[PDB]
């Protein structure tokens, strides 16, 4: 009964998971065509940071207390280094297994028992399907806000309202003892994080055609 409902939930979830993973394997090249993070990855192999924009910001504290501004901008993630750029693979792919354990001992024998077993299987199948749809929606929202934060950072860096990161090279020559040596040791140091500027002169306007 209820066990049939739960195993129908498991089977429907795994089936829809297989369907969506098979479809994502079938069409992938458009997705990796669109999602090229290395285009936005800067010259020092640095992941660009993440920004958020909000409009018409009004909250209420209590009576006789409301605060309203036009726009706000949120630094989500401070920019860090990277070795290889990310992909769609770690966001949009979802886990897949198959529950191959039917723990059925009260097998359906009466006719109404078979009927309720069938309808519990139905509702479990559709519930697992809808849960898979919810998980997919979660993942696509996550990758949407990631790419949107990257696009916002590039736009504001073009706007000249966020400081670009500051870097420096410190080099030492042949270093080590008579047992261990390195040819040309080199350290790369960042000083200034990507951060906003507030002064009025640094705002720069642009007008399209």
């Amino acid at each position: 009964k209820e066990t049939a409902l739960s195993v129908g939930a498991q089977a429907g979830l795994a089936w829809r998971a297989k369907i969506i993973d098979e479809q994502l394997n079938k069409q992938a090249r458009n997705l990796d065509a669109i999602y090229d993070f290395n285009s936005l990855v800067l010259e020092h192999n640095i992941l660009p940071p993440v920004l958020l924009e909000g409009r018409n910001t009004l909250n209420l504290a209590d009576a006789q207390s409301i605060r309203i501004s036009d726009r706000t901008y949120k630094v989500a993630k401070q920019a860090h280094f990277i070795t290889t750029p990310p992909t769609w693979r770690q966001y949009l792919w979802m886990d897949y297994v198959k529950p191959e354990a039917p723990n059925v001992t009260l097998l359906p024998k009466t006719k109404a028992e078979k009927e309720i077993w069938c309808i519990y299987t139905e509702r479990g199948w559709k519930n697992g399907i809808d849960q898979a749809n919810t998980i997919l929606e979660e993942n696509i929202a996550r990758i949407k806000e990631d790419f949107g934060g990257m696009i916002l950072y590039r736009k504001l860096l073009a706007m000249n309202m966020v400081s670009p990161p500051y870097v420096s090279h410190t080099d030492l020559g042949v270093t080590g003892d008579g047992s261990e040596i390195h040819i040309d040791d080199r350290v790369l140091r960042i000083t200034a994080l990507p951060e906003l500027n507030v002064n009025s002169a640094e705002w720069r306007a642009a007008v399209a055609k």
């Binding site: 209820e2 066990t3 739960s6 723990n103 001992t105 009260l106």
Partner: protein, 165 residues
């Protein structure tokens, strides 16, 4: 936290006869607790129209502990405490043995006594003397009850007795 007297499900895999008491284990297959197992024993009834199971040794996975919540068993979707087995085990055997030993004794004595009014005499001989010892031995072993025996593929429902944490 388990409320007092609620009903859960389990599956019994180990079969045992009502001849020697021993440990019996079942596995909880659904509900709040999953992967839990339960060992206990039975009780021998005065009358074998039913059989109930004393289940007290509960083992829970995840962490190492062994609580001792006592629970009993019921027939699932039947709402009874009986045993689904055979119970006509030891009626007809002892009845037929006692009646045959009797008929031997009677054949020898009455067909001896009818001599007033040789193979017939040898029939008198054999039944006359082998009836008596078999009769007293049958009245000796007539006291053995009829057994019940659970099977290795029966599910069960479990009612609770006290609360746990």
């Amino acid at each position: 936290i388990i409320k007092t007297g609620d009903i859960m499900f389990a599956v019994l895999d180990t079969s045992v006869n009502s001849d020697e008491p021993g440990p019996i284990l079942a596995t909880i297959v659904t509900g709040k607790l999953k992967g839990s197992k339960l060992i206990g024993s039975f009780n021998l009834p005065s009358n074998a129209d039913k059989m109930v199971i004393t289940f007290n040794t509960m083992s829970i996975p995840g962490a190492e502990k062994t609580i001792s919540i006592s629970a009993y068993a019921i027939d699932p979707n039947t709402a009874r405490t009986a045993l689904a087995s055979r119970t006509n085990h030891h009626y007809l055997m002892r009845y037929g043995s006692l009646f045959a030993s009797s008929f031997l004794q009677g054949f020898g004595n009455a067909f001896q006594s009818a001599n007033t009014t040789s193979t017939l005499e040898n029939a008198v001989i054999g039944l006359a003397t082998v009836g008596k010892a078999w009769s007293q031995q049958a009245q000796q072993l007539f006291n053995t009850p009829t057994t019940v025996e659970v099977y290795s593929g029966t599910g069960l429902g479990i009612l609770f007795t006290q609360d746990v944490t």
